[PDB]
Design a protein around this ligand. Structure first.
Ligand SMILES: Cc1ccc(C(=O)Nc2cccc(C(F)(F)F)c2)cc1Nc1nc(-c2ccncc2)nc(-c2ccncc2)n1
Length: 275
């Protein structure tokens, strides 16, 4: 029954063109789907896969079929009746959000940036309510379409810098550790894809966090947005906002946009003195 929320696609409707990545036991491709041709991403499961790999593969397809939300990647269908098996999703021409922002430094308004964050939060609120813990939320796992709409995904490549302390220390992954990651995502967006904690090593990042340090304000960042990402990074898990709280705050800021005009002070690293 695993594939109940999914559509089985016939192999003759799929054409693979270019390898765009690697999967658990198979390649990921960029291709076309016929149902007039629609571009798609395709993750395959090649010959020789184990029984565990097949459970995980069709399990991923099944949970994806169950999600139906504007800010979650949409499953087009699955090939389970023929070999190689395939997971087929929509294709986003703008690609991954972290690379997208880095190649478009300074090109959007703060209202546009905050709107992207509201979308990511609505998707995470939906996942958490469906009792799905993401565990690898980060800008590299989010796709942008040509309306600037962000869709939470998981390309499965796994992230110390994005992970809540209790998840690092004793493997407690929950929707509250995803909220910690979401705070880091807010910082990625407002910095146009800067690397969290810059050149600090993984061990330096954990020691700084445990000693109470937190990421400083991005440049040009609304006070309310920095306040919100700071509360995502509370050491005490039970003190973090839920995603329902985050969605609500972001929606109210956007709908009263003057609220975003008050900016947090930025700590300059360099002093330049001119007359
Ligand atoms: C084929 C595929 C299979 C599964 C997923 C996916 O997000 N699965 C998933 C699994 C669990 C949870 C979720 C959740 F909850 F929605 F986030 C999603 C996405 C994709 N789509 C995908 N994968 C990849 C990909 C790339 C590299 N390695 C693995 C997958 N890339 C791209 C892509 C890249 C650039 N432009 C447009 C689309 N799309």
């Amino acid at each position: 029954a695993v594939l109940k929320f999914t559509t089985e696609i016939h192999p003759s409707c799929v054409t693979r063109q270019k390898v765009i990545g690697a999967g658990e036991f198979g390649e990921v491709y960029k291709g076309m789907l016929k149902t007039k041709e629609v571009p798609v991403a395709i993750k395959t499961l090649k010959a020789g896969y184990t029984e565990k790999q097949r459970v995980d593969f069709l399990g991923e397809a099944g949970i994806m079929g169950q999600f139906s939300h504007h800010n979650i990647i949409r499953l087009e269908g699955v090939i389970s009746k023929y070999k190689p098996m395939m997971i087929i999703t929509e294709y986003m021409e703008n690609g991954a959000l972290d690379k997208f922002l880095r190649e478009k430094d300074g090109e959007f308004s703060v209202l546009q940036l905050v709107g992207m964050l509201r979308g990511i939060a609505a998707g995470m609120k939906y996942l958490a309510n469906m009792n799905y813990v993401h565990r690898d939320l980060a800008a590299r796992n989010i796709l942008v379409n040509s309306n600037l709409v962000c869709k939470v995904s998981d390309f499965g490549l796994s992230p110390i810098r994005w992970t809540a302390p209790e998840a690092i220390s004793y493997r407690k992954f929950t929707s509250a550790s995803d909220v910690w990651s979401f705070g880091i995502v807010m910082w990625e967006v407002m910095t146009y894809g800067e690397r969290p904690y810059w050149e600090l090593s993984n061990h330096e990042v954990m020691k700084a966090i445990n000693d109470g340090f937190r990421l400083p304000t991005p440049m040009d960042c609304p006070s309310a947005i920095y306040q919100l990402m700071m509360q995502c990074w509370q050491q005490e898990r039970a003190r973090r906002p839920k995603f329902a709280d985050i969605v609500s705050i972001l929606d109210k800021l956007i709908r009263a946009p003057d609220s975003l005009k008050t900016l947090a002070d930025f700590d300059p690293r360099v002093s330049i003195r001119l007359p």
